């Protein structure tokens, strides 16, 4: 039932071009936009960039836009398939591309259409997007996720020495999602004053995801600042800490560099075992309940060893790239126990849902995720609810490419009323709350 499709180039939260797709049906216009990461794993589906240095510094996405309007569009229209057939329409583009990593049209082109298709499908069945997604996934009793706000940005997301990428707070003890937003925001505002008083005002500017980017090096200090903010806000024991190390960003010849943003100096490099011993101290001295990408995307041995020696959540991101093939290996080698779900790491809604179900069926938790480069699109809000993962990270409660998703989640909770439950302390496995 697809009448027409038109893609365009828009700008993401960092000012870089990205793909946006408008899809028309008898129900009206449905548009979606595609995110873009900065710390991208080498195994992620291909993000097709034009490479025209004389334009957007080679970051244009006209090629991906043209593939959509000139090749993908006519094909989906010809199929005559209803937009409710997410799997059939997605597989169609997959075949049309014909490559494993979507290197012909680009994962950004395919995903742009896939997303618009899903929104049109929900309208076709007269249902909110989150409910439609739930049916596509095979879920009934939906639930609001615990939000993980990245309030201190480091790594390749900020201008500071801080090597680790994200320090997140999770309002596990909130009464509802709306309440979770309040605690998150309150801690964030308290944290601004905590940082300002110790490092000055020039340390309250933010990184790509809205978290403060203080001029610090020690990751322990970041944790200390967050913990102090939590306590000062009066939410100790109601808010826990999450981390995204994104170790692949500072992996240097088997070793790890916790100061890679400074002039290269191998003498400061540390081994995997040392890095792991550091994490143990963090989990011991701080309320750290989740650590994402603690080791390089290829350093499997380190993942298995660490995970087997911790009782917290270990999240695969660059390790798994929302890819079933990589997920299968991680589950067999018990490399981690949670999957970070990024629709643009694989390239289609169908594959993302499949990756999610695969993790869930193996006892893994699943945290839906934005990319460091986001747009005003809010698809992941409805996605996390429909997939009942119980957890999502989509930024600090700062910068609207972040708030747009959090605001949408509050609207979802409002619409569901007493039909949905907050994940709370069961963010790892909310299927028990039903």
What's the CA gap between 408 and 423, in Å, rounded?
A: 17
Q: 16 or 82, CB closer to a copy of itself?
A: 16
Q: 102 or 371, CB closer to Cl ion?
A: 371
The answer to whether 255 is a known catalytic residue is: no
In the complex, minimum distance from the CB of residue 345 to Cl ion, in angstroms, rounded to a whole number? 9
Is 393 annotated as a binding-site member?
yes
- Interface residue with Cl ion among 102, 326, 371, 393 (CB under 5 A) is 371
Q: What are the DSSP calls for 63-119, one per residue?
A: HHHHHIIIIIHHHHHHH---TT-HHHHHHHHHHHH-STT-TTT-HHHHHHHHHHHHH
In the complex, minimum distance from the CB of residue 51 to a copy of itself, in angstroms, rounded to a whole number? 15
Is 369 annotated as a binding-site member?
yes
Asked if residues 412 and 178 have their Cβ atoms less than 8 Å apart, the reply is no
Site string for Mg ion, 22-41 (x = CB under 5 A): -----------------x--
**Which residue, among 310, 364, 391, 318, has the nearest Cα to 155 in the 3D structure?**
318
Asked if residues 226 and 152 have their Cβ atoms less than 8 Å apart, the reply is yes
371 interacts with, out of Mg ion, Cl ion, a copy of itself, none, CB within 5 to 8 A per kind:
Cl ion
What's the CA gap between 385 and 39, in Å, rounded?
A: 26
> Is residue 372 involved in binding Cl ion (CB under 5 A)?
yes
- Interface residue with a copy of itself among 1, 10, 176, 429 (CB under 8 A) is 10
Q: 246 or 312, CB closer to Mg ion?
A: 246
The single residue of 186, 342, 351, 405 carrying the catalytic annotation is 342
14 interacts with, out of Mg ion, Cl ion, a copy of itself, none, CB within 5 to 8 A per kind:
a copy of itself
Element (H, E) at 64: helix 62-67
What's the CA gap between 211 and 205, in Å, rounded?
A: 8
> Is residue 219 involved in binding Cl ion (CB under 5 A)?
no
The answer to whether 342 is a known catalytic residue is: yes
> Is residue 218 involved in binding a copy of itself (CB under 8 A)?
no
> Is residue 181 involved in binding a copy of itself (CB under 8 A)?
yes
Find the helix packing angle between 272-285 and 219-232, rounded to 10°. Answer: 10
What residues contact residue 402 under an 8 Å CB cut-off, 6+ apart?
209, 210, 370, 374, 394, 395, 396
**Which residue, among 191, 168, 301, has the nearest Cα to 245 in the 3D structure?**
168
Is 298 annotated as a binding-site member?
no
**Which residue, among 354, 345, 331, 280, has the nearest Cα to 310 in the 3D structure?**
280
Q: 290 or 372, CB closer to Cl ion?
A: 372
Is 372 annotated as a binding-site member?
yes
What's the CA gap between 163 and 315, in Å, rounded?
A: 18
The angle formed by the CA atoms of residues 129, 133 and 137, to the nearest 5 degrees, is 170
> Is residue 215 involved in binding a copy of itself (CB under 8 A)?
yes
List residues binding Cl ion (CB under 5 A). Answer: 371-372
List residues binding a copy of itself (CB under 8 A). Answer: 8, 10-16, 20, 55-57, 158-161, 181-182, 185-186, 188-189, 196, 200-207, 213, 215, 261, 374-376, 378, 396-401, 403-404, 406-407, 410-411, 414
Positions marked active-site:
209, 342
Binding-site residues for substrate = 157, 166, 292, 317, 369-372, 393
List residues binding Mg ion (CB under 5 A). Answer: 39, 244, 246, 317
């Amino acid at each position: 039932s697809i009448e027409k499709i038109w893609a365009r180039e828009i700008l993401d939260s960092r000012g870089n071009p990205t793909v946006e797709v408008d899809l028309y049906t008898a129900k009206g216009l449905f548009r979606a936009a595609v995110p873009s990461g900065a710390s991208t794993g080498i195994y992620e589906a291909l993000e097709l960039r034009d490479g025209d240095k004389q334009r957007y510094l080679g970051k244009g996405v006209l090629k991906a836009v043209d593939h959509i309007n000139s090749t993908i569009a006519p094909a989906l229209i010809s199929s005559g398939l209803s937009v409710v057939e997410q799997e059939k329409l997605d597989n169609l583009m997959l075949e049309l591309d014909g490559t494993e990593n979507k290197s012909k049209f680009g994962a950004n082109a395919i995903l742009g259409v896939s997303l618009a298709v899903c929104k049109a499908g929900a309208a076709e069945r007269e249902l909110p997007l989150y409910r439609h997604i739930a049916q596509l996934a095979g879920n009934s009793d939906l639930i609001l996720p615990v939000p993980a706000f990245n309030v201190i940005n480091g790594g390749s997301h900020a201008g500071n020495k801080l090597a680790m990428q994200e320090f997140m707070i999770l309002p596990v003890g909130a009464e509802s999602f709306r309440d979770a937003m309040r605690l998150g925001a309150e801690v964030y505002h308290t944290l601004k004053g905590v940082i300002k008083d110790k490092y000055g005002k020039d340390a309250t500017n933010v990184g790509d995801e809205g978290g403060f980017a203080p001029n610090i090096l020690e990751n322990s200090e970041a944790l200390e600042l967050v913990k102090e903010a939590i306590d000062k806000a009066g939410y100790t024991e109601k808010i826990v800490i999450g981390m995204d190390v994104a170790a692949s960003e500072f992996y240097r010849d088997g070793k790890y560099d916790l100061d890679f943003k400074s002039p290269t100096d191998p003498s400061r490099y540390i081994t995997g075992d040392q890095l792991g011993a550091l994490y143990q101290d963090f989990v011991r001295d701080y309320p750290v309940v989740s650590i994402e990408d603690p080791f390089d995307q290829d350093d499997w041995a380190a993942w298995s060893k660490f995970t087997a020696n911790v009782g917290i959540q270990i999240v695969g991101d660059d390790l798994t790239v929302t890819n079933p093939k990589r997920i299968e290996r991680a589950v067999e080698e018990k490399a981690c126990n949670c999957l970070l779900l990024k629709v643009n790491q694989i390239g289609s809604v169908t594959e993302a849902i499949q990756a999610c179900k695969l993790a869930q069926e193996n006892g893994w938790g699943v945290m839906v995720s934005h990319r460091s480069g986001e747009t005003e699109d809010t698809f992941i809000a409805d996605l996390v609810v429909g997939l009942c993962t119980g957890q999502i990270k989509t930024g600090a409660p700062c910068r609207s490419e972040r708030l747009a998703k959090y605001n949408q989640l509050m609207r979802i909770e409002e619409e569901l009323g007493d039909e949905a439950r907050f994940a709370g302390h069961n963010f790892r496995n909310p299927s028990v709350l039903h």
